[PDB]
Amino acid sequence: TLPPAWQPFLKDHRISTFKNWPFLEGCACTPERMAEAGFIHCPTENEPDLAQCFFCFKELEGWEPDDDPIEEHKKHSSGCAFLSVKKQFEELTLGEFLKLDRERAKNKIAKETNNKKKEFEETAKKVRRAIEQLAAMD
């Protein structure tokens, strides 16, 4: 057992998340390929094919059989450092692993910051709309 917070760096842990993934053999976006590209399966009732990059936390859905997970990851999150990792996990140096883990942590902060901004703006629009109606009154 490696420390639970470091498990997502292991491709086999990532593959294990795809318990009910619908795209299997014959498709480009098989669980092996999705896990290779850095994705974990995060299904919901609303979004059963929802997948998240463990490293940059980009969330993608609406997968089709011909979707190449690497190509999709590159298209939607071109700055994700995981995409530049050419080595296998075991070949990473400790220094490299630690640097990747700090970059992942910065990414998680960035994702939370982004979700907080989005939530606030949803509210600010509704508020702004209401006040716009009042201002429109004599």
């Binding site: 980009k58 993608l60 859905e61 609406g62 979707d67 999709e72 939607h76």
Partner: peptide, 4 residues
């Protein structure tokens, strides 16, 4: 795929 597309952003959620």
């Amino acid at each position: 795929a597309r952003t959620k």
